[PDB]
Structures are given as structure tokens and as C-alpha cells.
Design a protein around this ligand. Structure first.
Ligand code: MG
Ligand code: MG
Ligand code: MG
Ligand code: MG
Ligand code: MG
Ligand code: MG
Ligand code: MG
Ligand code: MG
Ligand code: MG
Ligand code: MG
Ligand code: MG
Ligand code: MG
Ligand code: MG
Ligand code: MG
Ligand code: MG
Ligand code: MG
Ligand code: MG
Ligand code: MG
Ligand code: MG
Ligand code: MG
Ligand code: MG
Ligand code: MG
Ligand code: MG
Ligand code: MG
Ligand code: MG
Ligand code: MG
Ligand code: MG
Ligand code: MG
Ligand code: MG
Ligand code: MG
Ligand code: MG
Ligand code: MG
Ligand code: MG
Ligand code: MG
Ligand code: MG
Ligand code: MG
Ligand code: MG
Ligand code: MG
Ligand code: ZN
Lengths: 97, 139, 108, 275
RNA sequence: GCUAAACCUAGCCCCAAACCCCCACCUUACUACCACAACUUAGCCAAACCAUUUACAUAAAGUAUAGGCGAUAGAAAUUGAUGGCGCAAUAGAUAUAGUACCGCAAGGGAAAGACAAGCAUAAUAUAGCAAGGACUAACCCCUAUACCUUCUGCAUAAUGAAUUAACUAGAAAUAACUUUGCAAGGAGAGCCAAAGCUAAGACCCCCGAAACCAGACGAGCUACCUAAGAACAGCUAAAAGAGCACACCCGUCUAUGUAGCAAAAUAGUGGGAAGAUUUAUAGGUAGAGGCGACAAACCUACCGAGCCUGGUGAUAGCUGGUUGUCCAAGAUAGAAUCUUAGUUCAACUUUAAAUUUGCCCACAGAACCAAAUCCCCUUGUAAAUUUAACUGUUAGUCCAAAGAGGAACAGCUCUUUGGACACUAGGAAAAAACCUUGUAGAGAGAGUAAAAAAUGAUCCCAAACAUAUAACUGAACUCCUCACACCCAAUUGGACCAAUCUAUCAUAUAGAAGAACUAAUGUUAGUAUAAGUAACAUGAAAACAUUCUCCUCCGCAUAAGCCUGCGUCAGAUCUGACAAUUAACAGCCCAAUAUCUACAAUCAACCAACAAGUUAUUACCCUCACUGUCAACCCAACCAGGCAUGCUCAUAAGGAAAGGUUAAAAAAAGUAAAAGGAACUCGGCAAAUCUUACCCCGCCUGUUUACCAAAAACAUCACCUCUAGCAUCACCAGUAUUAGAGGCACCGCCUCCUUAAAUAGGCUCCACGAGGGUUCAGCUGUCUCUUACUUUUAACCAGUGAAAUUGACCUGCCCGUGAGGCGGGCAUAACACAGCAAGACGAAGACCCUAUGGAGCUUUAAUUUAUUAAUGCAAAACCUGCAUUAAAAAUUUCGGUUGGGGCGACCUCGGAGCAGAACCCAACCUCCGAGGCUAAGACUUCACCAGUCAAAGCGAAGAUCCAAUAACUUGACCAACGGAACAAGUUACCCUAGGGCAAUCCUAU
């Protein structure tokens, strides 16, 4: 048996808190603001991902370049190993040549 | 764990419910219930053909019994009722033999009559007048 | 060798619950007609035997307390007498093992 | 804990379903469960049978003295006695007429027995459960006792008669009560004992000597599964033939078949004409 | 009804921001207190080997450039810069914890907290993949060869699964296609643009080697060595690697044991036992290294190369797996390849799109030297070609036919035309390959197709029938009433969708993603089966004080090790509290300087030897502190094993071989045995008895393969050969009668009988041998030929209670097919218990082949001299740089078809029969050689790369890369001739991944 018996507590979502009521506001700051700013300049998050996209290999390479010299030793060694593996995989393994 | 099947129970019971009436461990253990249930449904599908074949052979047997009760084999009865243009099938012939003996007696008499007419005609020389029951009716 | 297939619960039930393996109901129990305790026919009433062994042990404790140490098997018969029982006329010249409780009704 | 809600609710519903198979609830009046309005229900009862019941008479044909008394006692209008009497009396008379005209030779004892069977509790309750009389009828005890269903059913027939006249009521009776004779043999409704005596009586009334019982056919005389075919005769002419395992039982069955043939109630009689 | 099943949070993951924190302790760490020093990543991995080589903001740009110009590598100038569609106790950190526990060590590394399977209630009744058609009826009747994966299909041919629950396997570009925006321009700079641009949508898995390299940890086992210690009774013999034989050490032969008492023991029988012996204690040698009386022996249970961490998610042309529903199209030309276990191209398949001919096909037509084939007008048809875009299959089996090879046979290799199979269904018995039949659902309707015999070895095999009119029976084929996408592998297209999160509703529309398990000897947890089976334990009586019977190479102490581990009390069937082991024994030491310090020990005296074994001066008049002290004990996971020394030598000390019973088999140990005494057997193994003789090998004692070989191997005195003229770390505080390295093995001598019978036995050279062979005599249950009794085991009662194994089983025999399960016969009420070993291909170890797997060994296989040593030349009597020669190593590889694998040939191109008549078609089948320029259209060696013909017109009559080159272009090798730039022999020590109807003849009529 892998199914619960009593009902879960009700997850109450407040669809009108501040974060949801104001979602998206200023996502047209460029078109409606004389192009002073750009939408990407509102993306809050990692230093090395604000307004950029890519597969895991490119993401790891970018992380190494921009914060590789600030990383803890073991995390950085893991990152280098990961880049090595992904290089081998994306460049030698796969259905399509 | 991001996504885990939360309802594997119902997918199991969909297959066990068809196995409660089995015998052994293969009525509560899925790994065996599945194989035997699948064999069960395959036989269930494939068995309709045999159902038709078997009911027809039962009817042929019952009709042979009834027709032998009146001194007349089964080849004669069917092969000489059609020569009288009676399209009674075999299900209803069996039902008549069991549940209406005298009607079947009459049908057997008719078959023997037509058989005799055929023998008499073939024994003769030429196209002498056809038998009183051997006259076909056209559409 | 080793088994080639698990044995099902059905075969195991036809073996384990076969009559030859069941515990038989005993046809030889009854009640001590006088004493009124359970007993088998060919065996002593357990309660009576225990109440006899207790007195035998007490008598033997007195015997040990009187003989002193080991290696003192007497060369005469022995008689045991309970309270208020003078040595009878037949028991003179036989060692007496005094006890300090009224003689049991079952001691004849 | 697996995160989710759908499987939990689905399992709760399945548990409730299982819990409503073991320990089912005590059955209760359909007039208490949800989705009930008496007026629409009674009007639909009318229109369903293809009959133009007068609404007031039909309303008072489903109310029983028990219900009136219980309402009077529970509080700290007409009842259906008269309609029930009219309906029962008319039903008896009309069934007698039907059976007499369909089966002329049958004796008055047999016709009265058939009429008691069809208007009895065993068949009236069956015809009253499968036409929603128990749902509309007012009483104390649920399920309504079969006697109360019977008296309410004939109250409804009485309302039908007082409303739409005799002929339509006769069609109603032909449609629901007489149909119950379908398949039943005669002596499954007219329960009798000592059939040979009754055969001898009827044959005497027609001035012919009592029948001689012979042994027509037999197989397995000595075994434990015999078959004796006993054939009554009446001055060298057969009038019946019966099977059995004992010769006594075969003679009894020969008497039963002879009685059926004389009373015109055979297995292959002209089937009742409903058109 | 038990067992269980359920839950939330304790916490954690990824971001953002901010730069983070009394005493004792480097000696033996956690100890109050005395005279040296630290300062290039190799290689797994790609190139399908491998050797140069191979990765550690945006844009310019994957451009310049580098590169066996292969795989791949790759700039710069300039440009400009508090949170969560995260986990929620098998997840998230390994975490309640780096604790418990494993390991000597480096190091490894957990678990968990809040009516599923299994059973009981309730054992079963002929028959059989356990179901289906059904039926009034559970069985009985008819039908019916388990699932996954791999091989051409596989009856199970083989692999995997006891069973439940949880967790467990498709990540992304280049183009294309679809839908939006804008459109000669698109885009929020860099880019593209001859309808394109911008955005989105779609597509590329999991587990597993032996290995390699680097840095740590290990000599508490074992090999050897060092320092300082210890043991060796008694007898015989007196200075001896002496004889018999205890302690001690080893481990010859047999039996027990084989998850055992023990991951190598027990009992007997054996070799040594004053020495080359054995042994306690501390130290040393460290992994291509150590050590080695060389056996590839040993270096912490597994060493032809330790172990741990890291590179490491090594790589794997090899094995195994790969998870919802439904539909549809869908299969066997060939070429090259260090290549035939694989890849690329083609052929075939699929989708989308464009266009118009495609298939069949008569008459005509295709050479000189039988079947048929090619080509098209019509005709029946509706398909075909072309374009854009991907994957997948590829060298299959059987049957008819024509050939080549082996007879015209060997169920034989190969080529060709056709069919079938790997797709449905019915028949010939079972039946992939023969005959009949396809497009799919419901029917309790119908018509047919194919389809029946004539006249040697367990146990024959449907039962029967000579003569009543020939028709009937028979499918998923066809018709009938209704409904329709609803029967192929690999692959490809499409329509739906379970559950979770997010946005908006507040189950739907969308967006997302750790998104679905009948299967990886998967992992974790639960419970089964074998199974209440195998195995284990407590001497007797009693008055619980005691007495009795029997046993021990045992016991007491110190040492080493361990650390409170049967003392009291109180709770239970082990938990807590309390208590204890008192120094005289043992450890913990020493003020400095100079001086000395020749002769053994052995009852130490006789003989005899060799292995040769502290004080004087100066300074100090201080006193007992500190620690060990227990036990039934330590190393072996808990234990018939291992454990140094002193003393008791059969016990003053210590213990208990039988839980109760009965006295079956088979098994184990022992005792006895008539007559005969090796006739057993490979052999006198075992046992009983104690004698003799020879032969082979080795001179002797000794040493060796811890755990299958103790030897005829190693070592060894003796002899011989080679090298070396000599200082303070080995040889060596040595010096040619010395030291090191080799061969051989003292010494002397030379450089026909046996048996009745027989394939066995019969350079000299004493002594010795658990060495090998033979013989005499004896002895005996080895045997002729077994038998009895005892003990353990055993069987039963009572307690405690495993493990391999297991798809499901409702688990028969015979014959046939290719066997408990299929077919045809036979048999058949259910159920324990004890036996047996014919069958369930019943549950480790070998042998053959393969891999452009791994690791070696040798070399006269290729490449090198980096390191060392000589020289030679420059550099200021020594070191630095360059060159040559060598040794020492280091890296690296082992082409293809094949008698029977090996031997040996051949490997590219060309011509003749197979392949009779367009094209093509194999051979280690059949027979032989070769190494002027421009330009419509075409042919081709079944791909590509190459190759071939050519009207007109103008002018004259064996690849790529590299080097030399101004050049016009040029060559050898690449002949393994689609070519690694340069690599052989071999693995009896090998390791991993895997695969496995007879020409010639024998015999009878
Ligand atoms: Mg049919
Ligand atoms: Mg490589
Ligand atoms: Mg955890
Ligand atoms: Mg964990
Ligand atoms: Mg259950
Ligand atoms: Mg089998
Ligand atoms: Mg298995
Ligand atoms: Mg040592
Ligand atoms: Mg891998
Ligand atoms: Mg391969
Ligand atoms: Mg299809
Ligand atoms: Mg043509
Ligand atoms: Mg069809
Ligand atoms: Mg839904
Ligand atoms: Mg998943
Ligand atoms: Mg599994
Ligand atoms: Mg057993
Ligand atoms: Mg036992
Ligand atoms: Mg002390
Ligand atoms: Mg002292
Ligand atoms: Mg002590
Ligand atoms: Mg003692
Ligand atoms: Mg004992
Ligand atoms: Mg015992
Ligand atoms: Mg003897
Ligand atoms: Mg020796
Ligand atoms: Mg020896
Ligand atoms: Mg027991
Ligand atoms: Mg067989
Ligand atoms: Mg048995
Ligand atoms: Mg290869
Ligand atoms: Mg290799
Ligand atoms: Mg040729
Ligand atoms: Mg060719
Ligand atoms: Mg070509
Ligand atoms: Mg020209
Ligand atoms: Mg080649
Ligand atoms: Mg070639
Ligand atoms: Zn008593």
C-alpha cells in the first residue's frame, strides 16, 4: 500500500497578495519607457544567468568564467569535473552525428 | 523527489479485480496476476469462434440423433430438405427436434419423401414428370 | 540438493494440518474420586504427590539435623512421630524423628 | 508523504463505497431522500400507466388509516377504506368474469381459487412494488407490510374505476393482474390435494365410471432411478398419461393432467388474447 | 484477527547579500620541571591501434592561426559591461553522525522518528501453464506448448525473475517542418538578406570490466636482517649439522570435516628434536619496490605484482536493461574498411511537398561464336518521378527449380528465378518453411476452401469396420443483420492521457517537468519457501548442607594483551544502583672530567678445542613521591584453532564426554571372528605384524609452493671460471691464502632368473631419504563373503532455531514429434512419516574462438637517449653545453581468407565456363599476364573516389598530406595495391568482456 488514508490539510493560496497582484508590472519598461531600461535588467537571480540561456555545458562554462574564482574549493572541483564529463558526452555520445 | 506516482494503487486494482477468482498466489501478486489475466482475456477473445463452432456441432449432433430416431441419417435430412426449398437452419431444427417432436416427424417424412422422389427420377429413363414435391418455385 | 520451486500455501496446509501431525485429544483423564483433582489413570494425582513430597522433605531435613554429618546411615529402623504422640509399644529401639505439626490425616 | 490530493480523495470515495456495501444503511422511505415532490410524483404515476386518474381520488387512494392515526398521535381528512372496498369487490367480480369467459368448463371452486391467487398478497405485492405504489403510499412501517400494499393497490383500482368507468378498469386489470398467470401451470395457483378423488368426482358428474389406471411404459423397474408412465383409461379410451418415479406418483400426475384436460387449462391452450 | 498500513516536521538544496571566526597537549599527543629543519601535473581518456598531438559578460569568431594540415586545438586589435513552477524521512547533506560498526593504517561508513506480500478465521478429492466457452451446478465436458531478452523461427535451445512496497534509465546542435510578428528588409548594436529575417515548438539513455597514472598507508601475518634475551626431559654415546625419544617445531599417508569446532581444523600414523634448530621482545627493508636455501614464493585471509584516496560518471565495436493508451505505413541487391561481434555510402522503409506520367503489355527490334530476359503503341489500372528531412535493416531459414563444390551422397559450401517464415487463421498427428486463406468488431445464422491410403534394443499402440444409393462435415475466406481507425520485428507518422507544480478560475484552459516499472544474478526495507527441517545443550541421587561416578599435557603465577566483562542489592529471563584492586613485588633512574677495561662459557679443575665469547679528583649532608595491582580475560565476527616464560608430572589444582526415550536403514569411530592369508587393488592404501634382499635418483643434515605438489627441485661442503691493487655509512674499521659474481656437486676412476601364468623388476662409489620401482617371510576383514556388539549420528517427545534454492504449478507412465506440460494410447479418491538416488540438462572448475580489451616475457620488431659510462669538442686543476659510441632501460604493436584451427599460399587490374539468349551474380570453383586546346550530349565495374566515349569549334599534321622546387609541376614507399609516416616471436603463470540413403568400403541374399 502506498496511498494515504486521511485527507491532506488544505493548501490555501491567496491569489491576491502583493506578489501575484503585481506580477509582470514593468515587463514593458522598454517599450513604454523610451528604452532607458531593458526587460532583462529586471531579472533578479544569479550573477551569471541574468538574461542568458543555454544548455548545461554552456551554463557551467559561464559559471566558471564569472564566479569560478569565487567558488569554494570542492564546488569548483565538482564544476570542473562536470564540464569535463559534459564535454565528452555532448561531443562523442549520442544518436545523431 | 519531484514527481512520484500517487495513484499506483488504482492501476494495480484495475488488474487484480479481474483475478480475485483465480487460484494461487496469482490472485493477489501483480507480477503473476497480469500474465494470467492477459492469457484469460486472450482466450476470452479467441473463444467466440469456438463458441460458434461448438454450438453448430452440438446442433448437428442433436439433429443426427433426432433424424436417426426416424430411420433417416443426417446427410439425407439436410441434403434433401433444401431440395424442397425449406431454409430452416440448424439451430431451429434442433429446437424443433427437442421441443416439437411431431413437427420434426413431419419434416423427416418430407425429407424421406423427397429422397424417394429423387431415387425414382434418377432410376427412370429421361425427363418423366417430376415428383410432386421436387418442383422448384422460382423467385 | 535444493528445491526447484517454492511450495505453495495449499501444499503446506495439506501437510501441516494433516491428522497425523495434530495433537490428539486424551481419552484417559479423570477426577480423583476422593481428593477431587485431575489425574491420568496410570499416574499419581499431582497435587497429592506434591503434598507428600513436602512432608518427605521436612522429615528428611529433621533426619539430617539429627544425624549430624554424612556417612551416618543408622543400623536400626526409623519411626516418625508428630506432636502429642508418645512412642508406641512397637517402636522402642527404633530411632525417633520428632516433628512439630499435627499428623496429616493422610498419614496412616 | 507523497504530495498530492487527487489520489487521496479518490481513495476516500472508494472507501465510502466499500463502507456502503458492508453495513448498508437501514432502508428508508423514498419520500424522505432528496429530490422528492409528491405532486409531480403522483401525476407521473397517473400518466405512466396511460390512465386519467382523478387527482383527488388518487390522492386519497394512497392514504391509509394507519397514517391518519399516526399523524393524530404525533401531533402532540379522509382515509381509503371505502375506495379499497369498491376496488377489491370490482376486482373480484371482473376477474371472475374474465376467467369464466376464457375457461368455461372450469368449476367454480377453481375459478375462485385462481381469483384468490391473482388478488392475493403474493402477487399483488409483486405488482405493487414494480409500479411504485410503495413509494407514494403513506403508512407507519417501512417497508410497507404486504397487506397494506394490497389494500392500497385495490384502493387505486377503485379510484380508477370511479374516475374512468368500468371498461378502462377492466383493461387495467387485464394488463397487470391477469398477466401474472403467464407460464404458471394450473395447480401451481390452485393448490389442491388428493387429485384422483377430484377427477373421480368430476367424471361421475359427467356420468362415466371412474377411470382405470394402467401401466403404459416403464424403464428401470428395480433400480433407484425408475421411470413409470401411468395412463388412465375410460372404457378403453385414454384420457391422460403421466410420468413419475413411483407408480403412485405417476398415477397422481396422470390424474393431474386429466384434470387439466377436462378443465381446459392445458400447457398448449389458446393463449390469452390481450389485443 | 495478527503482521502491518498511514501521517508531518526535524532538517536540508540553489541563489542573493555580506569578506569569516581555569589545567593539559609535537615524548607513547592531551604528560608541571635541563646542554637537524621549507622553497614543470604523469596518465585514464580521442585519433575507432599508437608513437607528434588531445580542451580545464556579450561581439569580433569558432575568423586569423596551429595541427601524423588527421582527431582536434584557437587568439588578439576593437566593443561594452532577500528569494524559490527546490526535497519532505529509501528524498534532501553521508548526517539524529563522520557517531555506531569494519580496517593494523591511510581509510570506509550506516540505520532511524511520527488491513501490500505473509498468515489465521477455513488442509485436500481423478485431469494435467490452472484459464476460457460455459452450466441449474465449484469439479466433471470442449479449447488451450508460461513471461522477458538473445539466436533465422526456437516445445524451456539458452539468460533473468521467491514475492510485496519504495527508488531506478532520451540531457543538445546543424538544417528542415509548423505557427506567429515584420516584410526588401528583419533583429533591443555585433548577424543575416537575390523573400528573407526574428520568436517559439520538435530531436540524441542506465548499469558493468580487467586496467593506467599520481599521492598517501602498511613488515603486530609472512620473507630476510639487526640488538639484547629464552628453551631444549630421559636413555645411548662423549666436543657430533651423532642414534632412540619427551617438551617444542613441522605437516608424510589415511579417515573425519566441506556454511565445518576451523575462510585449512580434528584423530591416528609420521620428519626433526644441541642445531643451517625453535622462540618471546623492540627496530629495519615499501610496490616495478622490498625479500626470496627460485615455488612467480611471500609482503595483514583473494599477489605474473599490495592496499586506500584522487584523475573517475576511466574506456568498453562486448553482456544486460530501457517504464501510459490506441491507430497507421513498414524486411534480406551491393561496395569499402588492421574489416566480417562494427561503421560509412548505396538499396529498402517512413513523413511533408511539387509535378506528370508510372506499372502491365502485344507487333517491331537485340551475333557472329532450353526455361525466359530486355524494350515499348494500346488496354486494366493509380500510381510513379522529383524535392526537403531524418532514423532503422543489411551479409537470415526452409521449399520448387537451374547450376558450380563434395558422388550423380552425405541433409554438405556457394550463385541465380520464385514462394513462404520472422504477421492472421484452418488443415497434413504433434508441425515457423508443405496445402488453404489475408484488412481485423458483435451474432446461440449460411455457402465453401484445403483436408481420410492402397496391395533390434522401457511397452504393441487410436477403437473398429469387407456392400443401405453420395451426399454431408469443414476457417478469422465469402454472404447475411448491425458497427468499423481497432491483428508484423527494427524504425517512422499521428490522436489521446494518468499523477505533480505554477498562472487564472476558486475540476477546466494553458505553461512546466526528477512526469508513469510484469523483468537490469538492479538497490533498500518487509515476509515467505527449503522448515518447525539441519544443528545446539544439563554427569547421578538428595535433606540444596551434601555424597557419589568419571576425566585432563592439566593447573597456579608472571609477562603480553583486555579494561570491570557471573562481587552485593533491586528490577528481568539481561537493565540500573552500590562496592572494589591499599607496596615491601614491578615500573619510573643515574652530576661532570680522565683513566682504564689482553686471557671465555661450559659444576671450571684435569685433559681437549673453535664458531673466539669500572675506578682517582671535583659537586651534593636532601628522603619514599608517582604509577600497575579486579575477573570466568587476550588474537581468531561468536570457536576441538594461536598464545612466551617459572613451577606441580599426575596432580593438594581444575573440570563433566549422556535434555528424555527406542535401539530401524544408510553413515562415522572402535572391539571380536571360523577356514584361507594379498586371491582385493592402479598400488599391501587401511589394519596386524615385524624380518630380508635388490634397483633408479639425489652424496649426506637442511629448505620450498601459509591454503591440492616436500620431490628426482633449491641449498650444501669439494672443485673450477670471471672481475677487482683498495679507506672513515654496506663489502670493511676488511686487503689476492682477500672481497664480489657465476658453473658444477665431496672424495677415488677420466676430460636368462623371477610367477601356474611377467607389457612389470634384475664412471664403481660406503652413509643417509615420510623420494620412486621390485622381491622374501610374516601379518591381518584388503579380499573369497561378510557377521555381532558398543559409541556418535539416527527415529520419537520437549526447548531454541538457520542456509543455499524458489517464474507459476492443480508437479503421472508408454510410444511419436521435435517432454510432467505437445500428439496418440494407459493410468488415476485425498493425506502424512522414514528411506533411495533413475529423472527434474538437479543445484563450482575446465576446454575452443572473438575483441584494432588488459598485462607481460624475449628479442636480430619500431622508435628514443631523456638518465648513466666512456670518449671527442668549447667553457672558467672541476663542473657546464654539444656531438658520437655503448650498455641500461623506457613507450609501443601483433593485418585479412583458410586442412581439422596450424604448415603453405594468395591480397590490385585484366581475359575465358559457371552466368546457354539485355544487365548483374560467389568462389581456397574451373585455366593464363600486366605494373594539342576547348565542348553539346552521354556511358560505368551495382555507393562514393576514380574510370570511359564524344558531335561540332579553335589550332597543328595507386588517393590525401609532406618535403625539392620561381616554375612548367615532381618522385619512391603506400603491392596488406581505398593507402596507420615509422612496430616482430610468444603466453603451460595469464586477467577481463563475450560466443560455443558413402565416391573408396564392412557384412548377408
Ligand atoms: Mg462453419
Ligand atoms: Mg585510443
Ligand atoms: Mg536520509
Ligand atoms: Mg543517507
Ligand atoms: Mg493481505
Ligand atoms: Mg521441462
Ligand atoms: Mg534463476
Ligand atoms: Mg617483525
Ligand atoms: Mg560505460
Ligand atoms: Mg567488432
Ligand atoms: Mg499494418
Ligand atoms: Mg512500351
Ligand atoms: Mg474478411
Ligand atoms: Mg482530469
Ligand atoms: Mg523517472
Ligand atoms: Mg527487479
Ligand atoms: Mg526435507
Ligand atoms: Mg538431529
Ligand atoms: Mg599503589
Ligand atoms: Mg619497589
Ligand atoms: Mg594479582
Ligand atoms: Mg578438585
Ligand atoms: Mg554433556
Ligand atoms: Mg540426545
Ligand atoms: Mg579371520
Ligand atoms: Mg631431509
Ligand atoms: Mg625424503
Ligand atoms: Mg523437535
Ligand atoms: Mg520420449
Ligand atoms: Mg518423503
Ligand atoms: Mg577489429
Ligand atoms: Mg591490446
Ligand atoms: Mg570473369
Ligand atoms: Mg563482386
Ligand atoms: Mg559506379
Ligand atoms: Mg573535332
Ligand atoms: Mg589493409
Ligand atoms: Mg582492400
Ligand atoms: Zn488425588
Amino acid at each position: 500500500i502506498g496511498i494515504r488514508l486521511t485527507l491532506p490539510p488544505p493548501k490555501v493560496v491567496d491569489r491576491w497578495n502583493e506578489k501575484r497582484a503585481m506580477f509582470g508590472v514593468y515587463d514593458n519598461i522598454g517599450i513604454l519607457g523610451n528604452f532607458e531600461k531593458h526587460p532583462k535588467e529586471l531579472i533578479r537571480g544569479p550573477i551569471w544567468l541574468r538574461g542568458w540561456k543555454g544548455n548545461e555545458l554552456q551554463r557551467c562554462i559561464r559559471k566558471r568564467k564569472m564566479v569560478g574564482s569565487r567558488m569554494f574549493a570542492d564546488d569548483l572541483h565538482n564544476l570542473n569535473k562536470r564540464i569535463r564529463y559534459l564535454y565528452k558526452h555532448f561531443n562523442r555520445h549520442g544518436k545523431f552525428r | 523527489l519531484r514527481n512520484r506516482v500517487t495513484d499506483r494503487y488504482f492501476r494495480i486494482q484495475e488488474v487484480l479485480k479481474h483475478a480475485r477468482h483465480f487460484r494461487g498466489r496469482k490472485n493477489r501478486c501483480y507480477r503473476l496476476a497480469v500474465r494470467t489475466v492477459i492469457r484469460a482475456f486472450v482466450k476470452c477473445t479467441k473463444a467466440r469462434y469456438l463458441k460458434k463452432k461448438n454450438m453448430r456441432t452440438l446442433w448437428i449432433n442433436r439433429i443426427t440423433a433426432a433424424s436417426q430416431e426416424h430411420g433417416l441419417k443426417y446427410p439425407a435430412l439436410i441434403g434433401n430438405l433444401v431440395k424442397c426449398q425449406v431454409e430452416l437452419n440448424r439451430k431451429v431444427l434442433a429446437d424443433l427436434a427437442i421441443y416439437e417432436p411431431k413437427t420434426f416427424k413431419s419434416l423427416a417424412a418430407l425429407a424421406s419423401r423427397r429422397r424417394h422422389e429423387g431415387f425414382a427420377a434418377a432410376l427412370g429413363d429421361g425427363k418423366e414428370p417430376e415428383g410432386i414435391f421436387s418442383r422448384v418455385v422460382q423467385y | 540438493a535444493a528445491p526447484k520451486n517454492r511450495r505453495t500455501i495449499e501444499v503446506n496446509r495439506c501437510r501441516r494440518r494433516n491428522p497425523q501431525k495434530l495433537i490428539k485429544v486424551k481419552n484417559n483423564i479423570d477426577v480423583c474420586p476422593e481428593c477431587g483433582h485431575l489425574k491420568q489413570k496410570h499416574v499419581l494425582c499431582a497435587y497429592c504427590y506434591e503434598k507428600v513430597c513436602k512432608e518427605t522433605a521436612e522429615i528428611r531435613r529433621q533426619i539430617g539435623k539429627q544425624e549430624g554429618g554424612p556417612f551416618k546411615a543408622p543400623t536400626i529402623e526409623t519411626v516418625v512421630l508428630y506432636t502429642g504422640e508418645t512412642p508406641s509399644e512397637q517402636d522402642q529401639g527404633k530411632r525417633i524423628i520428632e516433628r512439630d505439626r499435627k499428623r496429616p490425616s493422610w498419614f496412616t | 508523504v507523497k504530495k498530492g490530493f487527487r489520489a487521496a480523495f479518490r481513495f476516500q470515495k472508494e472507501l465510502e463505497r466499500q463502507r456502503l456495501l458492508r453495513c448498508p444503511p437501514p432502508p428508508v422511505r423514498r419520500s424522505e431522500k432528496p429530490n422528492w415532490d409528491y405532486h409531480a410524483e403522483i401525476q407521473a404515476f397517473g400518466h405512466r400507466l396511460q390512465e386519467n386518474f382523478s387527482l383527488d381520488l388518487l390522492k386519497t387512494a394512497f392514504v391509509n388509516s394507519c397514517y391518519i392515526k399516526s399523524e393524530e398521535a404525533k401531533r402532540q381528512l379522509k382515509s381509503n377504506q371505502e375506495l379499497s372496498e369498491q376496488g377489491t369487490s370490482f376486482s373480484q367480480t371482473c376477474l371472475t368474469q374474465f376467467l369464466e369467459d376464457e375457461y368455461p368448463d372450469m368449476p367454480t371452486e377453481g375459478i375462485k381459487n385462481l381469483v384468490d391467487f391473482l388478488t392475493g398478497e403474493e402477487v399483488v405485492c409483486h405488482v405493487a412494488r414494480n409500479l411504485a405504489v410503495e413509494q407514494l403510499t403513506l403508512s407507519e412501517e417501512f417497508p410497507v407490510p404486504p397487506a397494506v400494499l394490497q389494500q392500497t393497490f385495490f384502493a387505486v383500482i377503485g379510484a380508477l374505476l370511479q374516475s374512468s368507468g368500468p371498461e378502462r378498469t377492466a383493461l387495467f386489470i387485464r394488463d397487470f393482474l391477469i398477466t401474472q398467470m403467464t407460464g404458471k401451470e394450473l395447480f401451481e395457483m390452485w393448490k389442491i390435494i388428493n387429485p384422483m378423488g377430484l377427477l373421480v368426482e368430476e367424471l361421475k358428474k359427467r356420468n362415466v365410471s371412474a377411470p382405470e389406471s394402467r401401466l403404459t411404459r416403464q424403464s428401470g423397474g428395480t433400480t433407484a432411478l425408475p421411470l413409470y408412465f401411468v395412463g388412465l383409461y375410460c372404457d378403453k379410451k385414454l384420457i391422460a398419461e403421466g410420468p413419475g418415479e413411483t407408480v403412485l406418483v405417476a398415477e397422481e400426475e396422470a390424474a393431474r393432467v386429466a384434470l387439466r384436460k377436462l378443465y381446459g387449462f392445458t400447457e398448449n391452450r389458446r393463449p390469452w388474447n390481450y389485443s
